[PDB]
């Protein structure tokens, strides 16, 4: 009735009055433009000079309503482009929002957490500035209760989201000492039964395990892999997605880190992941399988044992093309590091036909990966005195018509590997 749909000039007139109630009503008016318009005029607000007036309102402890309205307006400006977030930061907002974390009003401390999450969420430099101003200690103090379930749901969701933005981004990664302060609380949110807190917790763990193997070790050492694998089997796709990403990041690390996810039973979920209706899940699960078949021979054997090779044959036969490209990598790694027996098993599962169908792809990376696999399969045929059998299989399915052509190919790596498979086998 009163503060609905003012113009910016009226907002300025109100904020500039020497009347705290008039400042209050024009702030609430600004907040409603910024929360109720799709396409809010963030830029006009900034150009009017209002950010530093809102930042000074954060400090009016005497008037908790204008604290809230300005905290809400600043949250929404900081949710915009990086130039918009920067205007909020340049206005002095970080330390003001950090003091508001101590507020006795929950709705105000919650809004301060939400604003700091938008600021941290902009990128590495603002993430690291928030840490430097000391946000971590009072953020974690807000979770220092015996049972998390006594906290309001939206409140705990906002905190988890902000903590996860403090773990996010990678040129550079968050300081080690920040990560070590945050990890124990993150392990605890990972056992909290609310799907949105579990989702954002797994995203946090996924950001922290992307990077060098030393970062992975610090997560894996906290003992979280079995809880991650349990979230991997959830029915909520927004949980399964970052749980899979975090697991996938872990198998890019050392053979010992890889074995922790095998030991926790991750491979039993892969039948469902590899046939998942959501193509992004299939893509990532196949990426993750490709890093497992880059493992040791005894890790290759566990993929075999769990019945997964037929699934990789299936995904190479019929998947979205980027999923097939990952299955191609999984095959090359398996054939480059597997025993001869493992490799015979692969051929017995029907690998040859779909491997050959992919040689008609117009993408040069995959063609090299596949020729690489052919040559590894042949080497194990060499070791067996069965190169005869193998060439017939390839000729019999259309392999030879395809490999011939790649002699006449506009890429050095391609025509060399193929004109050589011909010169050595076809013959």
């Amino acid at each position: 009735q009163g503060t609905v749909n003012w113009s910016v000039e009226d907002i300025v007139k109100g904020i500039n009055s020497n009347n705290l109630e008039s400042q209050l009503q024009a702030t609430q008016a600004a907040r409603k433009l910024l929360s109720r318009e799709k396409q809010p005029p963030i830029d006009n607000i900034i150009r009017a000079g209002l950010i530093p007036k809102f930042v000074s309102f954060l400090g009016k402890t005497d008037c908790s309503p204008i604290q809230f309205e300005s905290a809400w307006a600043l949250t929404n400006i900081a949710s915009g482009t990086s130039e918009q977030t920067k205007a909020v930061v340049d206005g002095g907002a970080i330390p003001a929002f950090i003091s508001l974390l101590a507020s006795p009003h929950a709705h105000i401390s919650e809004q301060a957490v939400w604003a700091l999450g938008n600021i941290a969420g902009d990128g590495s430099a603002f993430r690291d500035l928030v840490i430097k101003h000391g946000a971590i200690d009072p953020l974690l103090a807000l979770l220092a209760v015996p049972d998390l379930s006594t906290l309001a749901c939206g409140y705990l969701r906002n905190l988890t989201w902000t903590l996860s933005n403090l773990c996010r981004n990678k040129n550079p990664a968050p300081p080690l000492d920040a990560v070590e302060q945050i990890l124990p609380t993150l392990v605890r949110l990972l056992h909290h039964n609310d799907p949105e807190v579990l989702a954002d917790s797994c995203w946090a763990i996924s950001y922290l395990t992307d990077g060098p193997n030393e970062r992975i070790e610090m997560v894996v050492k906290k003992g979280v892999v079995p809880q991650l694998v349990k979230l991997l089997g959830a029915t909520e796709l927004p949980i399964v997605t970052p749980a899979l990403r975090a697991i996938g990041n872990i198998v890019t690390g050392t053979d010992e880190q890889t074995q922790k996810v095998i030991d926790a039973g991750a491979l039993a979920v892969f039948p469902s992941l590899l046939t998942n209706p959501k193509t992004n899940i299939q893509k990532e699960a196949t990426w993750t399988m490709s890093n497992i078949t880059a493992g040791r021979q005894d890790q290759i054997q566990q993929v075999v044992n769990h019945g997964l090779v037929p699934f990789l044959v299936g995904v190479l036969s019929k998947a979205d093309f980027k999923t097939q490209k990952e299955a191609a990598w999984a095959i090359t790694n398996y054939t480059s590091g597997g025993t001869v027996e493992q490799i015979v098993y692969l051929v017995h599962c029907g690998i040859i036909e779909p491997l050959m169908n992919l040689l008609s792809a117009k993408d040069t990376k995959i063609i090299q990966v596949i020729l690489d696999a052919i040559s590894n399969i042949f080497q194990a045929a060499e070791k067996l005195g069965e190169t005869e059998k193998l060439s017939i299989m390839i000729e019999e399915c259309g392999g030879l018509d395809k490999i011939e052509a790649l002699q006449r190919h506009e890429n050095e790596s391609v025509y060399k590997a193929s004109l050589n498979l011909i010169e050595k086998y076809f013959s």
Binding site: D210, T252, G337
Partner: peptide, 6 residues
């Protein structure tokens, strides 16, 4: 042999 995420 291992490949990190894009």
């Amino acid at each position: 042999k291992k490949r990190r995420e894009a």
